[PDB]
Amino acid sequence: VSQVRQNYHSDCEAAVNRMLNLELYASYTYSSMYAFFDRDDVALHNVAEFFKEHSHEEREHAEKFMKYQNKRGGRVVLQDIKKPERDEWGNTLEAMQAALQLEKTVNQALLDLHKLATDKVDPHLCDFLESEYLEEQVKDIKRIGDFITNLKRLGLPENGMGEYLFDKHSVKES
Amino acid sequence: VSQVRQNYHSDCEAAVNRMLNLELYASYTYSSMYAFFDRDDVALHNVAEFFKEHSHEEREHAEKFMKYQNKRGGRVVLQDIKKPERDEWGNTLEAMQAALQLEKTVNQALLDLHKLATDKVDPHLCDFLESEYLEEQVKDIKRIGDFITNLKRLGLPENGMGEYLFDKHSVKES
Amino acid sequence: VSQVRQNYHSDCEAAVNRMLNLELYASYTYSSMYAFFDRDDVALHNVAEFFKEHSHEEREHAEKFMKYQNKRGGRVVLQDIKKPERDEWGNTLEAMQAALQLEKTVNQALLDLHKLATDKVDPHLCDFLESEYLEEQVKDIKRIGDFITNLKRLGLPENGMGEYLFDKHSVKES
Amino acid sequence: VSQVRQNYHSDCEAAVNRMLNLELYASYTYSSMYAFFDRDDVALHNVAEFFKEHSHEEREHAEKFMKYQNKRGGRVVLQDIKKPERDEWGNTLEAMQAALQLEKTVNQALLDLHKLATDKVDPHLCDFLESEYLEEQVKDIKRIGDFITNLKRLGLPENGMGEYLFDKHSVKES
Ligand SMILES: [Cl-]
Numbered sequence: 001v002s003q004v005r006q007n008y009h010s011d012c013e014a015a016v017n018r019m020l021n022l023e024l025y026a027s028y029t030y031s032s033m034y035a036f037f038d039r040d041d042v043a044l045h046n047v048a049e050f051f052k053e054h055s056h057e058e059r060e061h062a063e064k065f066m067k068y069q070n071k072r073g074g075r076v077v078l079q080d081i082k083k084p085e086r087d088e089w090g091n092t093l094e095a096m097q098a099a100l101q102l103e104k105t106v107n108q109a110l111l112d113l114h115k116l117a118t119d120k121v122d123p124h125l126c127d128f129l130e131s132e133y134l135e136e137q138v139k140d141i142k143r144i145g146d147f148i149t150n151l152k153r154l155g156l157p158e159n160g161m162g163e164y165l166f167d168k169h170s171v172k173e174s
Numbered sequence: 175v176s177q178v179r180q181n182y183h184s185d186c187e188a189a190v191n192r193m194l195n196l197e198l199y200a201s202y203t204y205s206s207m208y209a210f211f212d213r214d215d216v217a218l219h220n221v222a223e224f225f226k227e228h229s230h231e232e233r234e235h236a237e238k239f240m241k242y243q244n245k246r247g248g249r250v251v252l253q254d255i256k257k258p259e260r261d262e263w264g265n266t267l268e269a270m271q272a273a274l275q276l277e278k279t280v281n282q283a284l285l286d287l288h289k290l291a292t293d294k295v296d297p298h299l300c301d302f303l304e305s306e307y308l309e310e311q312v313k314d315i316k317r318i319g320d321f322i323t324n325l326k327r328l329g330l331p332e333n334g335m336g337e338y339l340f341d342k343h344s345v346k347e348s
Numbered sequence: 349v350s351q352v353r354q355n356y357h358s359d360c361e362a363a364v365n366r367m368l369n370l371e372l373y374a375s376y377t378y379s380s381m382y383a384f385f386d387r388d389d390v391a392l393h394n395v396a397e398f399f400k401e402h403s404h405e406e407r408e409h410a411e412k413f414m415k416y417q418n419k420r421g422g423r424v425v426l427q428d429i430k431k432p433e434r435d436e437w438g439n440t441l442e443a444m445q446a447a448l449q450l451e452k453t454v455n456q457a458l459l460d461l462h463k464l465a466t467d468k469v470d471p472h473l474c475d476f477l478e479s480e481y482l483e484e485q486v487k488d489i490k491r492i493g494d495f496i497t498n499l500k501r502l503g504l505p506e507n508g509m510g511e512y513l514f515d516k517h518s519v520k521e522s
Numbered sequence: 523v524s525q526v527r528q529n530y531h532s533d534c535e536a537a538v539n540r541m542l543n544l545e546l547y548a549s550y551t552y553s554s555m556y557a558f559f560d561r562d563d564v565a566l567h568n569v570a571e572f573f574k575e576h577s578h579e580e581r582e583h584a585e586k587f588m589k590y591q592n593k594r595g596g597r598v599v600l601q602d603i604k605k606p607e608r609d610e611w612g613n614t615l616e617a618m619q620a621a622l623q624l625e626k627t628v629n630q631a632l633l634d635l636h637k638l639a640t641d642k643v644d645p646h647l648c649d650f651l652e653s654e655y656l657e658e659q660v661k662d663i664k665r666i667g668d669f670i671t672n673l674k675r676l677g678l679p680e681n682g683m684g685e686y687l688f689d690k691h692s693v694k695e696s
Pocket residue numbers: 001002005073074
């Protein structure tokens with residue numbers, strides 16, 4: 001074992017690798033959403049940029065797991081990054097509903113990791129998750145829910161004008 | 175009696191305490207409106223912030239009555255702050271209608287205090303009310319009426335797009 | 349249930365509402381202390397301002413619970429804010445003793461919430477309490493104890509000069 | 523009658539002259555207090571300066587009545603300025619007690635003027651009194667009461683150290 005390794009269970013090391021992969025998968029989904037909203041036949045550029053930003057965020061959170069792994073004396077083991085579940089994302093509402101689900105999936109995986117770290121009496125891992133991931137996740141889930149509520153209010157999916165307006169007012173100008 | 179007390183009727187002292195309480199009650203109502211518009215299933219953040227600002231305003235106006243009481247040599251006597259009448263506030267129109275009523279209630283209480291101060295020949299109290307409260311109240315009532323007129327124009331309660339637009343254009347960006 | 353809700357027990361939601369109320373109650377107590385020290389027959393203005401500051405602090409901490417509730421997909425439910433237990437607060441020593449008790453009461457309620465969150469396996473709630481409340485509480489309790497020790501040293505309640513000096517040196521000039 | 527005169531009762535004109543005189547009398551009292559605290563055998567220089575400031579304040583308020591008189595088309599009629607009631611003022615407590623009485627005397631005269639202006643249906647005079655005099659008077663009376671309370675707390679008249687400390691901490695350094 002690594003000369004730095006202390007209080008780091010094999011199960012947690014493996015779960016960190018899995019979480020790394022899931023963050024990369026989430027990044028890739030968001031990248032697909034970006035490309036969809038950039039299409040000439042979709043053309044919601046602020047929406048697209050929102051998803052691009054989130055893709056980069058998730059990639060950063062993957063990298064933070066790699067650094068963590070090494071700091072603890074675990075070993076990074078990479079797996080294929082699965083393509084997103086869809087090739088096209090319907091409209092802003094459908095995309096945001098998918099983003100909500102994705103965020104909740106990532107959140108559940110983080111909560112499960114936290115429970116494993118608790119059961120293996122690893123406070124450093126618990127703190128890392130709490131300090132670097134769990135709050136930012138609650139905030140992302142809240143913001144996407146807020147957005148879904150507004151898209152419904154605006155009459156999505158039918159109300160194109162509502163869709164247009166969301167891109168102008170709800171997401172930052174890009 | 176207090177060494178500072180001069181020309182300060184017991185009835186006015188008690189009415190000041192009641193007015194203190196009513197301002198605290200109004201503050202609390204507005205806080206409830208803030209929390210409602212912050213809900214993920216409501217999600218009108220500029221509306222929410224409007225109500226938060228008004229809550230803080232009313233709390234400041236309560237504090238000013240406490241300072242006044244003491245300046246005159248009266249004694250602050252606090253009562254429970256009653257919870258708001260509703261737990262949920264429907265939509266922006268219903269909330270603004272409730273705010274209009276609340277403001278008119280506060281205004282009537284201020285006008286009644288003014289009439290008591292007049293009848294007890296207390297010009298200092300009359301000036302305080304005129305200089306610190308009555309105009310700001312007229313302005314708040316006007317602005318909320320203006321808002322109701324615009325919400326109706328926008329098609330509330332049915333027209334969600336209208337609601338969305340009000341939050342973007344009528345209330346300050348928060 | 350709310351579309352954002354994940355890993356948020358009904359018991360914790362209700363306990364958050366109760367904690368909201370307790371922070372509002374604590375705010376109101378401190379406001380009463382402010383008004384007492386502002387009286388012409390008390391006239392310890394730096395003491396008064398200390399308590400005013402703490403009132404505003406507690407009101408901010410209530411607001412943070414409202415935001416938290418909504419972020420988790422819980423629902424803010426407000427109750428009456430009970431008036432303080434006393435109308436008058438004796439002197440600086442008695443007031444600080446009451447403040448110590450109040451802070452310890454708030455602290456116990458936060459610790460009980462933390463234990464509930466632990467038992468319901470809610471790390472986000474645990475982190476929120478630890479990061480936003482528990483340390484600031486330890487520091488407030490320490491500072492008030494320090495103050496009690498100094499008030500005793502200064503000869504309170506009998507030694508008026510000691511009281512006068514505490515207001516000049518121990519609390520910030522306001 | 524003066525070409526500017528409109529809605530200005532002879533009784534109010536005369537009462538303004540009397541009020542002018544009373545402000546000059548109050549100024550002169552405060553000047554006497556200044557000189558007393560400046561004595562080598564009294565030697566409370568911040569106390570002395572407090573009273574000097576108040577003397578100048580009262581002289582300014584006299585001048586404002588002269589300007590008012592002329593603005594309304596009344597005629598300034600001056601009378602002797604009576605010397606203060608005492609030649610020596612005991613100590614800081616006795617002086618502040620005398621100042622409280624003086625301020626309350628001036629306040630009663632202003633309130634009586636206000637009642638005369640009301641009965642003669644002179645809103646301009648009423649506003650002048652409310653806007654320029656009545657609030658500043660409430661504040662002066664409060665501050666002097668606060669001071670008396672602190673002087674008692676400090677053990678006046680017996681406690682010389684208490685007196686010394688009041689001059690250092692309660693009144694501005696001069
Ligand atoms: Cl290893």
